[PDB]
Symmetry: D2
Amino acid sequence: DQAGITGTWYNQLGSTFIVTAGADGALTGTYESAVGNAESRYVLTGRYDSAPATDGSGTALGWTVAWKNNYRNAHSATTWSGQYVGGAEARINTQWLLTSGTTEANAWKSTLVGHDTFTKV
Amino acid sequence: DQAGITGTWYNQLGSTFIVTAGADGALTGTYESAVGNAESRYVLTGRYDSAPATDGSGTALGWTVAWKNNYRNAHSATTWSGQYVGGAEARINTQWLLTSGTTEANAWKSTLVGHDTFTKV
Amino acid sequence: DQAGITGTWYNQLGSTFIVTAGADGALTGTYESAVGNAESRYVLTGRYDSAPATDGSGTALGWTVAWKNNYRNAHSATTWSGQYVGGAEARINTQWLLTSGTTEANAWKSTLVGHDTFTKV
Amino acid sequence: DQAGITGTWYNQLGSTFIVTAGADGALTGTYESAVGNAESRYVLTGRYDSAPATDGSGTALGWTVAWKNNYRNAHSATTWSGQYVGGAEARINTQWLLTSGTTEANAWKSTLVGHDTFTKV
């Protein structure tokens, strides 16, 4: 699914996920969030299963953005964990964890959780 | 915190997290899980905040392992999202999401969640 | 939103959530899962914010099912945490945690996470 | 484990969980958070597996607090999902989801996730 995954994806918020899937299981690219204290593109890296099951299961993958670029630094990082589902209506279905750097007193409220769906349209 | 993060870490399960923190915010290394249907080392990549706050907050970071290596393929990926806390008892405190590739019928049970604490000892 | 919440809801899997919202903030009712090792109705209880904000925000709520009834016992419990959004297309948007009873050796894989959307249709 | 669960528990933050486990699988009681915009006790309700496995597994349970009492209303709700582990050092190990009521524009950041461990000491 290297060809399937590589490209430009969009989630339900209008964020833009630009990724290249490598033969070796690497994901590399950029993320632009349509929401929050973020602007322009941020570096991402991740991994995917380069030899998925052939029984109709999705392709497991994940990636990370640290929210620092040349414009802003939110002192936080999001990881998306999900699966790629190929086909006419290809999708990447994810759950994510957004951790902020906090003091120890605030560490109990360091992490947001949510879910994003990415499509090619 | 490039020097702080780079090195060998261990979690509460006895898993081994070997990481190099790059000047550019990259994390690269290997993960060896002491539990589950996994053996030996797996590639990891991720990102960290290379310019954290100076107010005593932790350093946000995340990384991904896809559970495929030369020995086994679990058709799954884990992402850890957390923060590095420096000091005499340095720690990386994380939450994680483990997504399996599933059929659409099983997608509701695709994702495990948990929490790992890493130390240098 | 006592009148808004009280009633029969359905999620994207076809599960049926029957709830009564009490004046005192209580949720009581039954849950029937369309998926997994579950059959018929299970008791639920929970809580909701009986005096929500008037600024257009949703109404926070949560509930629990333990997966034991007169037919089956899965030795597990799900909690849904979410918000009620009123209007022509009323919705309850949730995230959930499904914890199984495990041995200590298996505790790292005790908890599934996911997300359900409930509608009145 | 009705006798095991019933009583006063404390988590790693110093919060106080007062619960009664009913014969019918009900949890009822009060929660006092040592952190956040909360004061005094809040009502809780939940469920537990009243007929757990006898193979050494923990006892699955969950509960909900809506953060409204006679003193404050945070317009939010937390659900804890976990298991009770009996013995000399009895514990309730949980993960939790804290959902705030939000506008639709802010719904992506409605939910915090974390983990609490409760002990009888």
